[PDB]
A = this chain, B = another copy of it.
Amino acid sequence: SIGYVPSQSGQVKIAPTVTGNISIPTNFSMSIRTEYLQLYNTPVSVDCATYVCNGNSRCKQLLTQYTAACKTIESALQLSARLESVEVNSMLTISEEAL
C-alpha cells in the first residue's frame, strides 16, 4: 500500500504565562530515544605509483611528468587519516575509577 506520511503529532510544550488557566505536566514516564553517531573512518593508504603504473619502471617515468597530482592524492588521504586519528584518540578519555 501507498499513503501520504501523516504529520505526526508532537509533544505539547506549555508556553510560560503570567496569569489565567495553565497546565502543569504530571505523571511522567521515561522513554528512550536512540541516536547513532559515527566517530571515525577506516584509514586507506593508496600507493599512487604502483596503482597507476602497476610497478612498471618505464611507466613511472611518464607519471613523473604529471608532477604533484600523484602526490596530492597520497598527501590528502594520509592527512585526513591523521586528523581523524588524533581527534578520536583525544576524544576518548577513560577513567579507571568509573570503569
Interface-lining segment among A49-57, A61-69, A70-78, A85-93: A85-93
Is A21 interfacial (CB-CB < 8 Å)?
no
Number of copies: 5
* Chain B residue, CB-CB nearest to A11: B93
Number of A residues contacting the other chain (C-beta, 8 Å)?
Answer: 17
Q: Check if A5 sits within 8 Å of B97, measured CB to CB.
A: no
Closest to A10 in B: B93
A-B CB proximity, top 5 nearest: A10-B93, A7-B94, A5-B89, A8-B93, A12-B95
- A-B residue pairs in contact (CB < 8 Å), sample of 13: A5-B85, A7-B93, A7-B94, A8-B90, A8-B92, A8-B93, A8-B94, A9-B93, A9-B94, A10-B93, A12-B95, A12-B97, A12-B98
Closest to A89 in B: B5
